[model samples]
Target: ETLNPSARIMTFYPTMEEFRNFSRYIAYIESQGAHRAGLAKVVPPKEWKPRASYDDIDDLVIPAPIQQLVTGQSGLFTQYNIQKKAMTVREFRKIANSDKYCTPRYSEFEELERKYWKNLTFNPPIYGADVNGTLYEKHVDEWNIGRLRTILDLVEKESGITIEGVNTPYLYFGMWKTSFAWHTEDMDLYSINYLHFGEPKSWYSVPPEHGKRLERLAKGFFPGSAQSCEAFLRHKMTLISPLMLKKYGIPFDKVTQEAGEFMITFPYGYHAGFNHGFNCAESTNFATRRWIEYGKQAVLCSCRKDMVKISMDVFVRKFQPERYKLWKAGKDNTVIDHTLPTPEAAEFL
Candidate 1:
């Protein structure tokens, strides 16, 4: 649609060499302002598929609850209507395989939503993401991609701490219009997502440069949410289209993550998107020494208290050995930095 213009959504084809030393190549891409685009995709060699098929303890038709969201729904969950429901993956697939799987734009979706709640047609989008059922139980060691050299992989390897969901991965099941609201990763750490199978996913992202501006904008729209925590968007409840964000003079990028592709998100590069069709995705948080300052600014807000997040302050002290090893190995200036990023970000610390 003309609502959006050409935005930078880079697709990378890593050579066998580049794939071998991908973290280095990725660091090169990062300096080239991949952060400016906020999101990029990496397609590994076509013939190089790792073993992800774990058909052992996991039944294909296992029951997993998915949230059905209504555009008309709003306010807090404990007090007001939460706009929710659940169905097994089999039943959800039944609807996905049936009629209703295509990319629907904003106003077009609104047209169907006009009669959605009133007519009770039962065609609402079932958002299913961050699933940690049976798949979470399966250790990443079984999946070869788990051995990918994410910085957190280095952190766990050298620092002797296993930060689940950061060093670990989570599964996502998505169908048409099944959206993930706008958000950054926990502790504002870099996140990598892989679309293993099914249709491509559409992603929209804002660069870290515009991170503060967009956060302020969303706070204005969801004022009640702002009453919750310092980082309200971490709630993953807010969503605004790229065109909509462009109206506020904020820069945004869009990309399609096809099957067998990897999508990497920069620190504070807020992102959101919907699945084009039924698809399965795997993603996890990763960090380098560069993320120390970003993590320093992330708060353990009231909502996320139950979740186990990495403690940057403690790690900074414990990271000395790894820091010295990197320095001794000819990697000097890029070791670790714990300086204040911005006064606003400093407020959280």
Candidate 2:
């Protein structure tokens, strides 16, 4: 079934060969007319590059809560952060994708990884970004209509969710060029954020339970209900990034640890922005998709030097759910939201 957009539907599964081709098509649609800003181009590293770390192996270390969730046999997954100790985003950018700069580091195993990354290159263009930014409304290369239609058919058949192309133009939060602050996709779904290019990192946290309690306690925050002018001022919110760190002292280089792929299943109903990690050299991040339970769960894929704000849902997702603390929601999102109750995050965002 279809609606105003194009009222048509059908399902067809592609063969492995077809799947590969479709992936190529996806890449093509996403990469069309991709451009680089002077602030965006990537340059390779000089002969001396920093050492990659043990954290690069996504499966190596497990977060405390995640370990609990996996071992506890709970239906809900737990939250925690993985420490990848390696080159920082800024350093990664400085090293770009040039073969000359992509040399092996650890002397003992140097030759083993020499040609492993010969064809890797950084991806440019972000999928979601500040709604009011300059490139927010632009569209470079969407998939061919026929291919999109076919993809939709598969989505409907597998997920039991309907797809309509026209009711509203597909909404895209644009010029994502880098990572976003932590955030959650709407509804139920987990995410496996893949770092297709440049080394990237992810931080996961548990949702704070108090937000719902507060919302419930406050007569003004009821569902199907709207906030009044005063209500907006009265009720406050906090984000999850701060909670992910034991203390705000995790070095960007140490905390972020380099990686090409990692997966974190989102907990709770909220999410936040993907923080654009640090910036260096010509390298720019190009994380894709948001607001999707699966791919959309990638609230923050690649980020630069800027500290992107986390979304309310994602904040709640990483907060103290058991105690329902006020500080959990208010403390970290702001570079200086002094009102936040958390004494730990008083100094930073």
Candidate 3:
């Protein structure tokens, strides 16, 4: 059976202890930047190079230089390196908008996409490191089981669908450092993310055919590979001619929902963590520390985007009975289908 691609809410019940800790973490993350804590921080394994190509392979698990896999101007490391040195949020946002961040495009992403799609190869050549990229791993501590069951029950009742298991296959650890590179989830696997903490985000998922049409649009207006096309789409896809990166602030319709005010991935949607700003807790999001060296091991494995497609059999392989037992015993599910108050949502007859 294929994995469902749509988003939905899963039940999440924080225990009294967890609730206190979780709230404190959110408050701290907003007040004190987690970056300073050096927990789960992403450090490049090697010194980055500029405009490098995959002249050949290296012994690294990462395989080759980012420049050779797709179109772009520099490697991922090089782009981040440049941005870190300059440190402008606006400029950094532009760099973040590139295919290199999402899909690993080199310096010439647009040109490559235009030329590559034209050739009908006997076997279509796959582009980018993501084609066979490593999938994230998933694990649910005993604490999460009750939460999962609560959510599963709600989903089965509301949507009339039953999931074979409550947990996903792979669990991702740490904050995701990139954006979508214009590839569809259908090609590899189906996934979702459970937001344990941090600012809510908006995702743009569409049909694969619509994605292809978007590719043509990219070639015509911008020359780049699928990743570059996605960057352009994100750049133009806002409330303004340029939209705000976060959709939480936007409000449109009164009855159904607001414009800008949109749904983040459901409780478990293909997800990852990002702190747009900082708070004051010693413990941060489930991504607790920005640097991996922090004492918390669970945070590294919990905040991944890759856990959505894991089968029940796979989830049990890495399961720890003690953790699950502790978490499952903690809380009961309490569902509230309520909306936050807004000026438009308030009626004036």
Q: Which ten residues in a row have the lowest lDDT in candidate 1?
A: 72-81
* Stretches > 4 Å off in candidate 3: 1-182, 186-188, 222-275, 278-349
Error of 3 at 148 (Å): 11
The CA lDDT at 46 in model 3 is 24
After superposition, candidate 1 runs with Cα above 4 Å error? 1-7, 52-58, 61-63, 72-89, 100-122, 133-145, 154-164, 318-349
| Candidate 3 C-alpha RMSD relative to the actual structure | 18.7
lDDT of each: 0.61, 0.24, 0.23
Angstrom error of the Cα, residue 55, model 2: value is 26
Candidate 1 whole-model C-alpha lDDT, 0 to 1: 0.61
**163-243 in candidate 1: lDDT tens per residue?**
665676667777775667788888788787877778778787886666778888887777777787777776666656554
Give the top-scoring candidate (lDDT): 1
Query: Model 1: how far is 18 from its true place, Å?
Result: 1.0
**Cα lDDT over the full model 2:** 0.24
lDDT of 3 by residue, 1-349 (tens): 0111121221233344433332242323223222111111111112311113322322223222122122232111011111112122233333333443332223543433323222212111111222122121134222231232221233345444333323222211111122223322221222223322222222333222123343354344344423333333322211110022123232111011111121212111122122111100011012111111111111112223443222222121233333344334543232311121111212320
lDDT of 3: 0.23
Highest TM-score: give the candidate number.
1
